């Protein structure tokens, strides 16, 4: 499924020309300011929901559970604790 250099197991390639420049000829940090701001904003905005939804839900769950637990072990919560056990 993977070969080695010389016979890596790619379908035959033809018609792609690849170009690059030397690391010594390039600015390694070209457009870094633009990328750090605009590119990171784009990539974060695109993935935000997949983090925010589960985190916000499980934080809310925990918050409700920890607040109930705290309340059950107060004087006010004596009766509700007695029923819960």
């Amino acid at each position: 499924y993977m070969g080695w250099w010389g016979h890596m197991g790619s379908p035959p390639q033809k018609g792609i020309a690849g170009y690059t420049i030397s690391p010594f000829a390039a600015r390694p940090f070209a457009g870094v300011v633009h990328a750090a701001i605009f590119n990171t904003f784009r990539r974060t905005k695109n993935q935000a929901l997949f983090v925010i939804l589960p985190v916000s839900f499980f934080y809310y769950v925990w918050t409700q559970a920890s607040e109930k637990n705290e309340w059950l072990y107060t004087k006010a919560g004596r009766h509700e604790l007695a029923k819960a056990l």
């Binding site: 499924y1 790619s10 379908p11 035959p12 390639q13 033809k14 018609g15 792609i16 990328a35 590119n39 990539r43 695109n46």
Partner: protein, 124 residues
């Protein structure tokens, strides 16, 4: 899963008017959110290929289609490592997202599944 399974189930859905009415719009949105077109892939480029069946289907691709697939994979890999998306002509338009591989893999699998059936035949 087998591509055969996926294709058969999809056909059941597309037949039922009710089902298609509710599923086809969902599936179109899903594909828009999936975002593989923004890397210039066609859907079929994403199918797992490290399987004997899929290796055989890829070998059956017409040379042109095969060379184009290699370009799309290399292009997408470069966008991935650059953390850039496709722009302009590199973005796969909905009309260009053709199932170029599905016919080949369905034939490979049809034979493989026939072979399994026939290996279990009982003379009556």
């Amino acid at each position: 899963a087998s591509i055969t399974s996926v294709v058969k189930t999809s056909e059941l859905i597309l037949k039922s008017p009710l089902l298609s009415k509710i599923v086809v719009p969902l599936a179109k949105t899903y594909v828009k959110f999936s975002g593989y077109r923004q890397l210039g892939f066609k859907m079929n480029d994403l199918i797992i290929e490290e399987t004997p069946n899929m290796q055989l289907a890829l070998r059956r691709l017409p040379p042109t289609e095969s060379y184009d697939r290699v370009y799309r994979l290399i292009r997408a890999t470069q966008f991935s490592l650059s953390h850039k998306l496709a722009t302009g002509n590199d973005i796969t338009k909905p009309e260009e997202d053709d199932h170029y591989l599905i016919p080949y893999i369905l034939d490979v699998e049809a034979e493989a599944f026939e072979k399994d059936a026939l290996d279990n035949l009982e003379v009556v």
